[PDB]
Amino acid sequence: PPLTLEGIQDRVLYVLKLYDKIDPEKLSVNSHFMKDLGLDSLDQVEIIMAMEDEFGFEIPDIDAEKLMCPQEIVDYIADKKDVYE
Amino acid sequence: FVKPIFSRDMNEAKRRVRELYRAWYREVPNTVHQFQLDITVKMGRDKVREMFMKNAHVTDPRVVDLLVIKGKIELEETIKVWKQRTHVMRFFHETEAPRPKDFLSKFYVGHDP
Amino acid sequence: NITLNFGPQHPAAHGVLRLVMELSGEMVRKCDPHIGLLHRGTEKLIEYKTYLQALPYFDRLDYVSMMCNEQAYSLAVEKLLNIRPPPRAQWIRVLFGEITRLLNHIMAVTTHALDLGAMTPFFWLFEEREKMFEFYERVSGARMHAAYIRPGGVHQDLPLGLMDDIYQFSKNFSLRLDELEELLTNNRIWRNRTIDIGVVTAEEALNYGFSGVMLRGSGIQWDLRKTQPYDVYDQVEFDVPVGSRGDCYDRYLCRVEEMRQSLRIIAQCLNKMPPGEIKVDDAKVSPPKRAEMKTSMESLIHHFKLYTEGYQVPPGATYTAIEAPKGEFGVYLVSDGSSRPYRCKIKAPGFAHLAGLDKMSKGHMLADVVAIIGTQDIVFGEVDR
Amino acid sequence: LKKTTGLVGLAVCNTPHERLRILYTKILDVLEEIPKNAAYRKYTEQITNEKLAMVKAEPDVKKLEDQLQGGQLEEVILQAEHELNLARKMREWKLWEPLVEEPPADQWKWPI
Amino acid sequence: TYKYVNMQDPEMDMKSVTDRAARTLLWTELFRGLGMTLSYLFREPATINYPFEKGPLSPRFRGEHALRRYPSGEERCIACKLCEAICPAQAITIEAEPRADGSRRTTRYDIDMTKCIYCGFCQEACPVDAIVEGPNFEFSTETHEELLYNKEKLLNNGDKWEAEIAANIQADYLYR
Amino acid sequence: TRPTVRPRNDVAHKQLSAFGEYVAEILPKYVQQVQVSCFNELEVCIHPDGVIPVLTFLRDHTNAQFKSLVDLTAVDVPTRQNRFEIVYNLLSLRFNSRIRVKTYTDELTPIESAVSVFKAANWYEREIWDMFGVFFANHPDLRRILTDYGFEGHPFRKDFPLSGYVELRYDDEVKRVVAEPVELAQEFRKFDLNSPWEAFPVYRQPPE
Ligand SMILES: CCCCCCCCCCCC(=O)SCCNC(=O)CCNC(=O)[C@H](O)C(C)(C)COP(=O)(O)O
Ligand code: SF4
Ligand code: SF4
């Protein structure tokens, strides 16, 4: 329930651990899932939906038009969970 | 030029496909259990990734959107627990012999082209 | 709710429908009529065949009435060839068009009784439909799927023996309908099963293109005989039933009346057949007698041709409606002028009815639905194709 | 008046004449805002006018269906209502520009 | 030209009324209708006693195919191959070849009853009246293969039934 | 010129013709040809972008209440780029008249759906969708009629074989029916019965 932000990023990266397509080293605070990571768009959908399945709320693919950095994932979560503290 | 089906330019269309993938990608276990498929579910998801690969050369947004129209229409028959287990397995063609793309074997087989 | 596939397997399903329902307690909600379980796809199969070869296909759609289908083809082919048959052929086409009508309505009556569990009339009347199949056999060599009606008219002249026994055949038949008169027509249980069920407002009918008794039951008076007496119907005396309530009871009584009506007509067709060829004079459409082809050369030549490449229609694509007992019937030719059709769609009268069933389905309990399929005379063969 | 309309979907509406004059005045009321130039408008004028006078030709419901030469005009009030929604539809089709886009000659070039 | 069904209105007259309520109670007509079925018990049953009796058939009747010979004992077939052009299901297959005597003769006439639709076109179509749609009808087989006839089996069929076939043609030939 | 010949009904041809110019007046924007053969059979063009607005008008009285879409008969001719030739057979019951009013479409043109207008085309819809690929304006469901489940083809495209590519059979160890490559025995032994030497000079497209 507190939804601490850093632990949210811990959650997302752990999902990336469970996630297949990414290399564990390739995992990072900023590298883009379209413009940096070599994983294709279907992998974009793959992580975006696994993550939203964790957060239990729909992520419109317009946010995939956003997405950019994973940092903007946790950023959106700060704008989504709206606890941001 | 000529008036579009729905999407105009790829992104209006690209948005629809992802909607499609998840629409399958979540639906798959439901299908795995309704028909009691003996396939491991990851194989199902893999096939889900594969049929989305055969359509890679598509470039007209009317072709993309018409393909997701027909693909969602197939999803209709899937979710409503229509079809039968056999129809689900038609995508696999497992009864059929593997095809050797190698030309030498193609020589060895028959008259062929 | 509870999702449920029905037929084909049900006797009520007639081995064709799979109208799935998402039933509540037993009252219906969703009730979609799937089809394509019989779809023989004959539209492409017609395309690669000489026009004489197309002829069997129509015995293959209306399983029961048969001669009427072929007449539905001979009219539509003779239009493009502008050919007008010798009169005797038309008196025949009416005669067996009406006997086919007797077979069709006896079929629909007794089967509809079977879904209502009546059992007996079935056995009381197929004893008669063999009596008629003995006749199509006497004129065609086949008990059913007789090819006796042809675009030139008819394959062959009537055997001398029929003209008496057929009269004998209808000497007693009215009584056999009397025996039904003493059943369902008056019977108490029967009214309850069918009264005030699947009532249809005139407009939905005119929208979906309902035709035949299915119009005549709900009061629309549209008809394909007296409006367009395409054959000898113009000379024939008869009178058309019209329903009141739109009750299945109405449509029923109508069909019984039409059966009476053929009892009226067939009398007169027996009363009025001219001597004459039962085929067109032309050897470029109608083939020579075996006696003449085997001496005269040109007869054998055109004989050889019609049986190998056949007559050639002048090019054109056209459409013709038919007074099937079940309704308007579709003959949509597309001909390049070659003996092969380019295309040929076939509107089944029952197609529109089945399109309309779900409107009559929802808000009715399942027995109502079983009543409905029998309401509409639907042989499913014609419908998907 | 005859009991029972006979038809299933149809239902009786007593004093048809007045209700018809309602429909005449109203479809006239919509054709007026349609421009004179549209080819439909003059003929729908001819229709509504000749039919209105034709209703005026006789009083009772009885011979009225003879004067228009149609059995039970009790339906044609409904057809007039379709005619009314139609005339409502005429407005969004605008005045009628003759033809737009034409077939390549291969079209309608029958045979083949 | 149209006729209303039903529509008629029942009498309010008290005799008739109490009679209808008497139908509503004592059922009356059911029994009357019921009585009618009793009439069938006293009629003679319609079954033919198959197979020691058999159903009537017209001479025209179509059935098993059979090739047949000249009175001389030569086969009638000339391999004109139009009957191959007509079989609507195209069951027929023919390879005409010269005889050593030089006459046209089929080397492998054949037909499968699996695709034959027994329209009996070929009975009509043949110029030499070679092939004939014979009287026989009862010949269901244990296996599919027994259906795919060679010219051979058809000839045998023309052998067993030739008396019969020629007899029916003797009855029918004028009509054609 | 009579015993075999079918008599030519000039009267109805006259009336249908005059009404044909009448309609030609009424909807200049879409109506084109006013074909009128001696079969007493009238015909009219429509531009596909003009499907609905014409058809609705047809249902409503002018001097012909084109009630009941009896048929949406469909034809495919590969030569023309507008290969499709959707046809609206119609019948004004009040006037006992009959008419044939057709159009054309390309493979990706979303031709207007008269589903709102007639509803009879809830299936003329899906057949002519499925057999072809004639995409339609806005229909409640474009699920296939007739052709199976996983079936991919579009027969009646006058393209790919009459047998089709597909031929299913039950199979053993999979315990189930499976689609397989065709392998027809004997093959449809097609006869080219086309006749050189034209029999109808009156027709005959010019060599040009
Ligand atoms: C048990 C499961 C059964 C399996 C059923 C399978 C059902 C599949 C349904 C088939 C429908 C389609 O093909 S859907 C039609 C869409 N397919 C296309 O190819 C359109 C164009 N695609 C592109 O341009 C991109 O390369 C793209 C590939 C999108 C990648 O996206 P990104 O690179 O920008 O991330
Ligand atoms: S019947 Fe004998 S002759 Fe006539 S075609 Fe068949 S084989 Fe050739
Ligand atoms: S029997 Fe009927 S179908 Fe079989 S070959 Fe002779 S004609 Fe063609």
Contact C309 F195 (CB under 8 A): yes
Burial class (CB in 10 A: 0-12, 13-18, 19+), E161: buried
Whole-angstrom Cα Rg for chain D: 19
* Closest alpha carbon to C217 in D6, F84, B48, E169: D6
Which DSSP category does C154 fall into? E
> Token digits for D39?
């080819």
A40 is a catalytic site residue: yes
Element (H, E) at E148: strand E148-150
* Chain D residues touching residue C220 (CB < 8 angstroms): 7-8
Rounded CA gap, F33 and E87, in Å?
42
Q: C122 CB contacts (<8 Å, ≥6 apart)?
A: C110, C111, C113, C114
- Ligand sitting nearest the alpha carbon of E131: 2
Domain regions of chain C by residue span = 1-385
Residue of C nearest to E3 (CA): C241
Contact indicator for C281, C83 with CB cutoff of 8 Å: no
Rounded CA gap, F178 and F166, in Å?
10
- How many other CB atoms are found less than 10 A from the CB of residue B91? 14
Query: DSSP string spanning C354-378?
Result: HHHHHHHHTTSBHHHHHHHHHHTT-
* Closest alpha carbon to C82 in F199, F40, F201, F7: F7
> Token digits for A41?
């768009």
Whole-angstrom Cα Rg for chain A: 12
CA distances from C381 to B19, C32, C57, C195, C377 (A): 40, 19, 11, 28, 12
Q: Can you tell me whether residue B32 is helix, strand or coil?
A: helix
* Closest alpha carbon to F109 in D8, D108, B62, E50: B62
Q: How was this structure determined?
A: cryo-EM
Instruction: Please report which residue ranges of chain C form alpha helices under DSSP H.
Output: 42-47, 56-59, 67-81, 87-115, 120-140, 162-169, 173-181, 188-194, 202-208, 213-216, 248-271, 290-293, 297-306, 349-361, 366-375, 380-383
Tell me the residue range of the domain where E96 lies. Answer: 65-175
Which DSSP category does E173 fall into? G
Q: Do chains E and C touch (3 or more CB pairs under 8 A)?
A: yes
The verdict on whether omega for the bond into residue D103 sits within 30 degrees of 0, i.e. cis, is no
Rounded CA gap, E131 and E136, in Å?
14
Rounded CA gap, F89 and F111, in Å?
17
Q: Do chains E and B touch (3 or more CB pairs under 8 A)?
A: no
Which DSSP category does F121 fall into? G
Contact indicator for F61, F38 with CB cutoff of 8 Å: no
What is the β-pairing status of strands C327-335 and C341-345? Answer: antiparallel
Q: F158 CB contacts (<8 Å, ≥6 apart)?
A: F76, F77, F78
Rounded CA gap, C217 and C146, in Å?
31
> Token digits for E57?
């058939």
F123-152 b/e (C-beta count within 10 Å ≥ 16 → b): bbbbbbbbbbebbbeebeebbbbbbbebbe
Contact indicator for B85, B35 with CB cutoff of 8 Å: yes
Q: B58 CB contacts (<8 Å, ≥6 apart)?
A: B64, B67
* Chain C residues touching residue E5 (CB < 8 angstroms): 241-244, 250, 253-254, 257
Q: C358 CB contacts (<8 Å, ≥6 apart)?
A: C31, C32, C33
Which residue of C137, C157, C239 is in closest CB contact with E1? C239
Single-letter amino acid, residue F136: F
Contact indicator for F97, F65 with CB cutoff of 8 Å: no
Element (H, E) at E24: helix E14-26
* Closest alpha carbon to F104 in C47, C336, D102: D102
Give me the CATH code for the C1-385 domain, please.
1.10.645.10
Contact B25 A64 (CB under 8 A): no
Name which residue sits closest to atom 8 of ligand 3, judged by CA.
E87
Q: C372 CB contacts (<8 Å, ≥6 apart)?
A: C197, C198, C248, C357, C360, C361, C364
Mutate to test the interface with D, among F19, F23, F27 (most CBs of D within 10 A): F27
Rounded CA gap, C284 and C302, in Å?
6
Rounded CA gap, C378 and C369, in Å?
13
CA angle E2, E3, E6 (to 5 degrees): 155
Query: DSSP string spanning C71-138?
Result: HHHHHHHHHHHTB---HHHHHHHHHHHHHHHHHHHHHHHHHHHHHTT--HHHHHHHHHHHHHHHHHHH
CATH (domain of E99): 3.30.70.3270
> Token digits for D65?
């269906």
Domain regions of chain B by residue span = 1-113
Helix axes B61-79, B10-25, angle to 10 degrees: 20
Sign of CA dihedral C88, C94, C97, C98: negative
Chain centroid to CA E151: 23
Mutate to test the interface with A, among B10, B11, B21, B48 (most CBs of A within 10 A): B21
Burial class (CB in 10 A: 0-12, 13-18, 19+), F40: middle
Rounded CA gap, C68 and C94, in Å?
8
* Chain E residues touching residue C253 (CB < 8 angstroms): 5-6
What is the β-pairing status of strands E131-133 and E110-112? Answer: unpaired
Rounded CA gap, F21 and F44, in Å?
11
Rounded CA gap, F121 and F106, in Å?
20
- How many other CB atoms are found less than 10 A from the CB of residue D12? 11
> Token digits for E38?
């009793």
Contact indicator for C93, C282 with CB cutoff of 8 Å: no
Q: E-contacting residues of F 167-186, CB under 8 Å?
A: 186
Single-letter amino acid, residue D103: P
> Token digits for C47?
């395309």
Contact A61 B19 (CB under 8 A): yes
- 């029923």: which residue's tokens? C252
> Token digits for C114?
């079977």
* Closest alpha carbon to C124 in C184, C69, C67: C184
Q: Is E111 annotated as a binding residue?
A: no
Contact indicator for F103, F33 with CB cutoff of 8 Å: no
Single-letter amino acid, residue F168: L
Q: Is E94 annotated as a binding residue?
A: no
CA angle D29, D30, D34 (to 5 degrees): 125
Instruction: Please report which residue ranges of chain B form alpha helices under DSSP H.
Output: 10-25, 28-34, 41-51, 61-79, 85-89, 103-109
Helices vs strands, H then E, count in chain E: 6, 7
Contact B3 F110 (CB under 8 A): yes
Rounded CA gap, C262 and C3, in Å?
45
* Closest alpha carbon to F22 in F64, F55, F50, F59: F64
CA distances from E157 to E77, E125, F207 (A): 15, 20, 55
Phi/psi at C324 (nearest 5 deg)? -70, 150
Residue C262: HSE in the Cβ half-sphere, 13 Å Cα cutoff: 22
Element (H, E) at C318: strand C316-324
Q: Can you tell me whether residue C324 is helix, strand or coil?
A: strand
Rounded CA gap, A69 and A28, in Å?
9
* Closest alpha carbon to A64 in A27, A28, A33: A33
Residue E80, ligand 2, Cβ within 6 A: yes
Sign of CA dihedral B58, B63, B65, B66: negative
| Cα Dmax for chain C | 76
Q: E64 CB contacts (<8 Å, ≥6 apart)?
A: E113, E133, E134, E135, E136, E137, E139, E157, E161
Contact indicator for B5, B62 with CB cutoff of 8 Å: yes
Rounded CA gap, C222 and C202, in Å?
11
- 């008869």: which residue's tokens? C238
What is the β-pairing status of strands E2-4 and C240-242? Answer: parallel
Q: Is E116 annotated as a binding residue?
A: yes
Which DSSP category does B3 fall into? P
Rounded CA gap, A47 and A19, in Å?
7
CA distances from B7 to B24, B61, F143 (A): 21, 6, 20
* Closest alpha carbon to C238 in C97, C68, C50, C27: C97
C28-41 b/e (C-beta count within 10 Å ≥ 16 → b): beebebbbbebbeb
* Closest alpha carbon to E118 in C144, C131, C108, C260: C144
SS3 content of chain E, % helix, strand, coil (to 5): 35, 15, 50
* Chain E residues touching residue F191 (CB < 8 angstroms): 85
Q: D32 CB contacts (<8 Å, ≥6 apart)?
A: none
Which DSSP category does C288 fall into? P
Sign of CA dihedral B53, B54, B60, B63: negative
Rounded CA gap, E135 and C182, in Å?
42
Rounded CA gap, F178 and C383, in Å?
27
Tell me how far the alpha carbon of residue E89 lies from the centroid of ligand 3, in angstroms. Answer: 7
Q: Which of A20, A23, A36, A40 is catalytic?
A: A40
- 């909607």: which residue's tokens? B19
D52-80 b/e (C-beta count within 10 Å ≥ 16 → b): beebeeeeebeebbeeeeeeebbbbbbbb
Query: DSSP string spanning A26-84?
Result: T--SS--TTTTS---HHHHHHHHHHHHHHHTS---HHHHHH--SHHHHHHHHHHHT---
Phi/psi at D14 (nearest 5 deg)? -65, 155
Rounded CA gap, C308 and E86, in Å?
7
Q: E74 CB contacts (<8 Å, ≥6 apart)?
A: none
Which DSSP category does B113 fall into? -
Sign of CA dihedral E97, E103, E104, E105: negative
Counting other chains too, the contacts that B70-77 makes at CB distance below 8 Å and 24 or more residues apart are: B71/B20, B72/B20, B72/B23, B73/F141, B73/F142, B73/F143, B73/F144, B74/F150, B75/B20, B75/B23, B75/B24, B75/B27, B76/F141, B76/F143, B77/F143, B77/F149
D84 forms bridges with which residues in the sheet? none
